[PDB]
Amino acid sequence: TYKFVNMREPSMDMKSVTDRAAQTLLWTELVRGLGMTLSYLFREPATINYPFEKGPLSPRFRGEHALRRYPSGEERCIACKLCEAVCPAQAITIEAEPRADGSRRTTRYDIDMTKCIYCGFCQEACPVDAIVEGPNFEFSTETHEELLYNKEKLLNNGDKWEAEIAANIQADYLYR
Amino acid sequence: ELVQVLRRGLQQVSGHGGLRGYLRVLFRANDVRVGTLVGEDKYGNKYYEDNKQFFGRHRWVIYTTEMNGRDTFWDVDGSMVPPEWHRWLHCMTDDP
Amino acid sequence: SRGEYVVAKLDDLVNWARRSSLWPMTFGLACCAVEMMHMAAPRYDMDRFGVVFRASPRQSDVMIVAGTLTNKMAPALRKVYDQMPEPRYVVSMGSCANGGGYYHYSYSVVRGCDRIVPVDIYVPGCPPTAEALLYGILQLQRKIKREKRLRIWYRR
Amino acid sequence: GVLRLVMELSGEMVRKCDPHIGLLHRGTEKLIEYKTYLQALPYFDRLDYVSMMCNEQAYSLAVEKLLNIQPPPRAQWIRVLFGEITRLLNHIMAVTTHALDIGAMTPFFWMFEEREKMFEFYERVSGARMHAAYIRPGGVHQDLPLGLLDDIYEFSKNFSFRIDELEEMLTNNRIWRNRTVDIGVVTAEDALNYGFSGVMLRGSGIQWDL
Amino acid sequence: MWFEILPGIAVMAACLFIPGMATAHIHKFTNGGKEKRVAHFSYQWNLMERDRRISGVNRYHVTKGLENID
Amino acid sequence: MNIMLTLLTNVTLASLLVLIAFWLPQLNAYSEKRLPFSMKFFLVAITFLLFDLEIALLLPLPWASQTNNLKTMLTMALFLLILLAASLAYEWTQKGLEW
Amino acid sequence: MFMINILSLIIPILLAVAFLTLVERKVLGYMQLRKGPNVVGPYGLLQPIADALKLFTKEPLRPATSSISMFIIAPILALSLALTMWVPLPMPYPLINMNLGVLFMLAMSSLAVYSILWSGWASNSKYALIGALRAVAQTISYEVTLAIILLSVLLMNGSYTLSTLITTQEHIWMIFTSWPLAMMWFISTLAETNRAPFDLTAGPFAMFFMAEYANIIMMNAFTAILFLGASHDPHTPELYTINFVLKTLALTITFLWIRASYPRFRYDQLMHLLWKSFLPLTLALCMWHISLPIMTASIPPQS
């Protein structure tokens, strides 16, 4: 099934010709456009009052990264390097070794936020929910070097945002 | 008609604690709307809602004038909101 | 004394004037330009902050690099930056402009726009939301407010 | 976007027009060879940024064809629904920007509000507004939020009035017609032999739609 | 809403109020409370010069009535 | 005298404003680092000049309407406008208004 | 107290054109389902002051090879003409009462094109020179029909004095006697100031902007005086001032409305518009308005 968009033929009787001439000489459609713009002027704008008002988000939103830990206070990351293997941008660097108590923990965990494409593959490849992409998005920076996160920065991000991150995970983990 | 809207403007002036509060809110947030206070923050931020506004304008925060170490009567930013009020304010959840 | 008071107040006035009217010219290289046009959309309304839409290069205060800067394009961006009058600021938007991003290991991509021009604000994201770019613009405004030129001139 | 255009004119008329491209050549096809299929999926979001979901669907269909598998019916229905949403998004951007270049510039804002609403839909379904990476080569990444379909219906029941406002501002305007009528006329044979597709075919009367 | 455009417009109006009004008041102040005399066609100028000569204070706007007929 | 003073004040205000605009940002130290000849433009300029001359001829019309020779004045004014229309028609028909 | 009158005519005009930018921004924003500037100042009022201060503190890009003389001269001529064109306007009493006020207005408007010519020439760019040539051609083409329409309308007034336009329109507006000439005059004034849909084209830039906006406000005031005749009672001129200012504001807001409503023409399209639709009708209506007072025995008094 197909439709014709511009296959009309104007009527050539005197009344229609006079109507077209009146449109030409009196600019009727121009006043129609003016009137529509005028009507648009008299309605409420759609502008929100940032930063005092914020745009709507969802639990699935992917923002700044964070490293979580168990309720006992022990970090969830076990240096399985799955997030590093799946990272499309090669933005994750991990080095590990046995801890003093023999635990399998990382000694280096860097994320280059100028390489990251914020796809969320790392947080869906993680089997222990250690690395997540939090809901923070207002972390602009004045220098390049501060966008090169290391393990301390990501752990601090997790400790900073744990409440909201855990609430979002609780809200959205049944869809995963 | 006109009388009702001017009366509502007068109530908006009254509801911010007088002329001083009206001017303070107008020069601090460029908005003079009044809504039910939803929450108070341990850093001083106040969180209000108004469900009769359209989506995106139904929730807002008046920032505190003094955060950890800096005066914040003028220099405010969105990174000041604590994570729980950050969740409520961004409409990720319906519960303060 | 009054001598430093005068220059302090003049600094406050000049900084307020400069940051209260920022006229940006945007390099809409790639998909981050779409988020720029959404920050210019009715919901966020950059114009309401005094930040006009699509200023001319000869009358622009801030340059927004929103996209991937390729080797074929770097000279043009540097020329446009050099044509800009002073004081001039550069905002780097998105991973592609910040550090190359998804195309960092490429033969035809400049690994960050800061190899070509100095950058004042880095806006992270792929792409940053319109709210994120607005936050970056307001942070640049705060950075401009912090600066002090007549005072430096006076104590030198 | 970004473009260099070297053209020779004889007064007002355009005599020759040679476009130079490669200013946004990132070398995506060589980078894809170093990634797995899942790792190579997000590049297609960045290929045609105006309509991100459509690009991924094409790649997913190719990979599914090569894998000899098929997605479940619900995944296919979700993919078609979001493809039509992305077509709406693409068309709004294309028509408004074109009008903006001519100089109309009001429908740009009028319709970018709706574009923001569709970006909200994208974010709710995936967490990303533009580079969603929602459509995978086995289906989709995740099931929809419990309240998404009702909001999509609420949005789509008011869009016809927005299109009507756009048409009222543009369709019958004599300036718009004089700017657009009889410009870039292409014959059906030339359109077919030059490799055209989409509206560029259907505008010449060729009845074709994949 | 739309009435937020009214303030600036008001200011603009006030500015456009100043010139013409000012002229009027000045024309009242420099002409003894009357409109500035319009002198085209060189006959009105002759009348103004005659008034200036017969005023006794070299001001055309000082009108002399029947009280000066003696 | 009044008009000359007004023009002098206008020029002085513009000159002072331009001088301060050019010299306020000059006191602070900074980095401080063809042939085509389209004919249709000349033709439209010449057509404008000729129509301007005929407008100059048409200008005394408001005073021309009080002459007691109303028939002759009306005939001459209509003749001048008819000649203007004829010039426009000749330029139109001979492809003088094209691009 | 003549200098005080000159200053009270000049400074308020500059303030009005400074805040017309704010008015235009807010009007366009609200016609675009958004707002204008509302952050700087209580209602965005302090935006023009910030704009001016930022512009006057920004490094000026002298071409470093062009003619500095003309680079400085062009804004001087533009702004001087823009301020000069305001003096004959009766609101209701003109600052300078000219016998031929209309002709002086026309002469200043004709002078206004040397600024465009010199700026394009001193740009030291072939592309900018081409643009300046197109702008000058459009300007002269439309002032032709401006002058013809102006004389056709003034044939009903009896002289070139603008003060007599108030007496002519004591009972009825001039819009009713000739609305087609009024529509053509409005479009020609749009094309005169390079406003949409005819907008095909630091310090000195700001001064050029001030000249253009002053020209816009002046043209709208001239239209209001010429075609919308307010009533002037000699014992309270503030009523006429109020009415005239309101009409001028309405016309300027109509300019903003038209800019926000339509796309722009091509160069050849507006050239053809003028030379093939306005000029023939303008000539025909000039003949009609020459004939009409003689046919109906309604010749205006003054001679």
Ligand SMILES: CCCCCCCCCCCCCCCCC[C@@H](O)O[C@H](CO[C@H](O)CCCCCCCCCCCCCCC)COP(=O)(O)OCC[N+](C)(C)C
């Ligand atoms: C008459 C002669 C003219 C000659 C030239 C003079 C220039 C014109 C004079 C008028 C200047 C207008 C100044 C008004 C600025 C006040 C703005 C105020 O609100 O700023 C606040 C206060 O900040 C600063 O303290 C204000 C500094 C302004 C200048 C300080 C005093 C300078 C007076 C010196 C004048 C003498 C001039 C002599 C040489 C010309 C901070 O707001 P801001 O951060 O933006 O925005 C935050 C947005 N929020 C609130 C919504 C979240």
Ligand SMILES: CCCCCCCC/C=C\CCCCCCCC(=O)O[C@H](COC(=O)CCCCCCC/C=C/CCCCCCCC)COP(=O)(O)OCCN
């Ligand atoms: C019985 C004796 C009567 C005496 C004679 C009276 C006859 C009156 C009847 C006819 C007169 C009507 C003429 C009025 C002007 C006509 C000009 C015209 O029609 O030109 C149009 C074009 O005009 C325009 O398009 C101009 C539009 C400019 C864009 C801005 C829109 C403006 C509308 C907003 C409102 C205008 C307000 C006007 C009045 C303001 C007063 C202050 C034709 O061009 P095209 O359609 O492209 O076709 C030509 C090729 N064949």
Ligand code: SF4
């Ligand atoms: S979000 Fe994607 S690109 Fe960023 S670190 Fe995780 S896997 Fe790598």
Ligand code: SF4
């Ligand atoms: S996938 Fe999780 S547990 Fe494995 S290395 Fe990454 S953060 Fe650690």
Ligand code: SF4
């Ligand atoms: S920064 Fe991210 S969103 Fe922007 S163009 Fe590059 S890949 Fe696309």
